[PDB]
Amino acid sequence: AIGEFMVSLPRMVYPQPKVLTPCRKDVLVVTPWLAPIVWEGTFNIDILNEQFRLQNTTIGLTVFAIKKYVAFLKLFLETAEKHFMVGHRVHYYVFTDQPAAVPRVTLGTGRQLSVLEVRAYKRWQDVSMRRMEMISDFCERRFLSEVDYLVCVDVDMEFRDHVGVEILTPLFGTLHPGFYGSSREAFTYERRPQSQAYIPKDEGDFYYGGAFFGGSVQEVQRLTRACHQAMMVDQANGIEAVWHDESHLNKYLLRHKPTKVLSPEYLWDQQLLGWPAVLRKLRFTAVP
Amino acid sequence: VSLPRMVYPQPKVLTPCRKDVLVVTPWLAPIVWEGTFNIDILNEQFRLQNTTIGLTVFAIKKYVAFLKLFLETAEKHFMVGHRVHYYVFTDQPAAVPRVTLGTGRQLSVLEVRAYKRWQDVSMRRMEMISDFCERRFLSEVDYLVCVDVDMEFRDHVGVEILTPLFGTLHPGFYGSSREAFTYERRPQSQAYIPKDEGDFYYGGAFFGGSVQEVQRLTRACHQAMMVDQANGIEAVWHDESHLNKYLLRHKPTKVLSPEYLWDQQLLGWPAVLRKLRFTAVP
Ligand SMILES: O=c1ccn([C@@H]2O[C@H](COP(=O)(O)OP(=O)(O)O)[C@@H](O)[C@H]2O)c(=O)[nH]1
Ligand SMILES: O=c1ccn([C@@H]2O[C@H](COP(=O)(O)OP(=O)(O)O)[C@@H](O)[C@H]2O)c(=O)[nH]1
Ligand SMILES: c1ccc(-c2nsc(N3CCNCC3)n2)cc1
Ligand SMILES: c1ccc(-c2nsc(N3CCNCC3)n2)cc1
């Protein structure tokens, strides 16, 4: 459930926070609208685990494994079992055009998997963009009844380290690994004013990655519905945004600020970008 | 909420403004210091919800003398541009000064009984706030902010503080280790906190949050005080001891820095304080 009020914790023994001696001095750990930016060294997972377990929190994790991408499912799910929300209730939702191709993966207690059979679009761009419609539709059909939070990711990925309840909040985006140190002028936003995804050169907080966002079911439903509607307007105007669903996600999160932002620890490509000292952990990485 | 177009400086992921202080708690609540927030963005967010902030103050006996300066300075500095409702609890309704209010701001005077012991005045604020959450606040304001009266605003105190539940770092202890915190240490008291527990020492003079969370906090503190009283014990720092026990077990969703609760006579103006926003009056 998502409790209405603050939860009451038991006695716990842990290191005292140090007001005058911050651990992370190398990165921004809070946005200008006071949302935390989640990096290793900013959170005590023991405190957060207690808070979320006291509410019997259930987390849904969506992936789209359409056409040849079914091949990524085995590694995605096996690594998720090792690293994603361990100790909490988890419900995997695999959207696929090939239910028979979903691999057998043994799950820990309190974790389950649903296979959602959906149509495959011809263009990869359309497969990627129609995720928004499909997520929104299923919020109404299944997710509002089944889970408290939804985490929506790309399937061509693997978990390498802890990804846990520190990410949970009403609405989050993730810093795209290619742009976390870039000026907003270098952000690859949609720059064409005719598109619903338009963002001018003098606007933008961050470039968020389309491959990892989430929130409460209600906020995810609203985000995905808004992005799908904006994509349909663009379609009617004969326009396709430069980076598809990611461009629309960026426009949405510019105008509706996320309540947490995840650092690139949560979305990385190690072959392309190596392992900068600013990244103490690589948690969720692209599969070649 | 859906924001209109705004132009402001881009946040810088690799070049944080505050490197001298902790700006987030281990449970991922921001700690509010100058340099961590853009008030333009936050003002938009809260105005779009037509946010009303209630501010409670208890002005009992001779403390009514602090009201004029408290209210005049609140008019310059507290939530300017938002709807404000002042709730002045006093034993002397006729002694409340006439203070001219800006548009969208109102004041209600609530008559209450004066206790003889200053400790009792301070502690019974918990019962009265909790009772008034039900009688009035829940139907009148969105957030409640609960402060001492013997104070003045000297700089901006705005919507950056608003959240479901907040406490404020006590200005005498922000640099102290938990062993030095003046928590209640007797296990006989409901406010008991062991030497190996505690995140921060929160000041009793500035807390708040949504009406529902404030009603819960103040109710719990009052009940714990009543238990202590039945057991013949009074916590070392009264309401503040109970507030600290409550916020230890129910983590606040924002923590305010001591910019928000200061005494310049006792503590000066250290480099770590870029602004002194709300300060004790001598
Ligand atoms: O034929 C396809 C194309 C894409 N996708 C889904 O859409 C996501 C985004 O596509 P992709 O990962 O190729 O985008 P990229 O990371 O390369 O920018 C994939 O991870 C899949 O989850 C899919 O299932 N089948
Ligand atoms: O006789 C009293 C005692 C206290 N108070 C209220 O209770 C708060 C706490 O009292 P005090 O300011 O003396 O506490 P201190 O800051 O000295 O610890 C005051 O600010 C007032 O708002 C009051 O009005 N009259
Ligand atoms: C520059 C451009 C892209 C990336 C990048 N990292 S992960 C990723 N994806 C998209 C494909 N699906 C898996 C997630 N892409 C990094 C730097
Ligand atoms: C050491 C001890 C107390 C303080 C201190 N700052 S403000 C404050 N109060 C309590 C009295 N009412 C006004 C608010 N007290 C500072 C340093």
Whether A63 lines ligand 3, by a CB cut-off of 6 Å, is no
- Expressed in angstroms and rounded, the spacing between residue A187 Cα and the centre of ligand 1 is 21
Q: How far is A100 from chain B (nearest CA, A)?
A: 42
Classify the C-alpha dihedral A102-A150-A260-A24 as positive or negative: negative
Q: Which residues of B39-55 are buried (b: 16+ CB within 10 A; e: fewer)?
A: eebbbbbbeeeebbbbb
Of chain B, the end-to-end C-alpha distance in Å amounts to 42
Q: Give the gyration radius of chain B's Cα atoms.
A: 19
Q: What is the three-class DSSP state of B213?
A: helix
Nearest to B202 by CA among B240, B236, B228, B232: B240
How is residue A204 written in tokens? 């933008």
Distance CA B115, CA A97 (A): 73
* Closest C-alpha to B152, from B7, B254, B280: B280
Among B residues 22-51, those touching chain A with beta carbons less than 8 Å apart: 22-32, 36-38, 41-42, 45
Residue closest via CA to ligand 1's atom 25 equals: A66
Chains A–B, number of C-beta pairs less than 8 Å apart: 142
Among A161, A129, A160, A136, CA closest to A150: A136
Q: Does B272 touch chain A (CB under 8 A)?
A: yes
Q: Which two tokens stand for residue A26?
A: 């190398």
Which residues of chain B does A180 touch, with a Cβ-Cβ cutoff of 8 Å?
A: 13-14
Bridge-partner residues for A215, per DSSP?
A150, A171
Q: Is the dihedral of CA B136, B142, B147, B151 positive or negative?
A: negative
Q: What phi and psi values does residue B38 have, to the nearest 5 degrees?
A: -100, 110
- Residue B253 structure tokens: 């969703």
Cα distance between residue B256 and residue B202, in whole Å: 9
Q: DSSP code of A223?
A: H
Q: Which residues contact B98 (CB under 8 A, 6 or more apart)?
A: none
Going from the Cα of A284 to the center of ligand 3, the distance in angstroms, rounded, reads 11
**Counted domains in chain B:** 1
3-state SS class at B154:
coil
Can you tell me the distance from the alpha carbon of B85 to that of B52, in angstroms, rounded to the nearest whole number?
7
Q: Do residues A247 and A229 make contact, with C-beta atoms less than 8 angstroms apart? A: no
| Residue of minimum CA distance from atom 17 in ligand 1 | A156
Q: Which of residues 127-186 of A touch B (CB under 8 A)?
A: 166, 175, 180-181, 183-184
**CATH number of the domain within which B120 lies:** 3.90.550.10
Distance (Å) of CA A197 to CA A49, A191, A200, A219, B239: 37, 8, 10, 19, 52
Domain extent at residue A19 = 1-288
CB B19 within 8 A of CB A19: no
CA A149, CA A89: separation in Å to the nearest integer? 11
Give how far the C-alpha of residue A232 lies from the chain's centroid of Cα atoms, to the nearest Å.
23
Inter-residue contact A151 to A62 (CB < 8 Å): yes
Resolution rounded to one decimal, in angstroms: 1.6
How far, in Å, CA of A44 to CA of A38, rounded?
11
Q: Is A100 exposed, middle or buried (0-12, 13-18, 19+ CB in 10 A)?
A: exposed
Q: Is the CB of B80 under 6 A from ligand 4?
A: no
User: Which alpha helices (H) appear in chain A, and where do they start and end?
Assistant: 45-53, 73-83, 124-129, 131-138, 144-146, 217-236, 244-255, 270-273
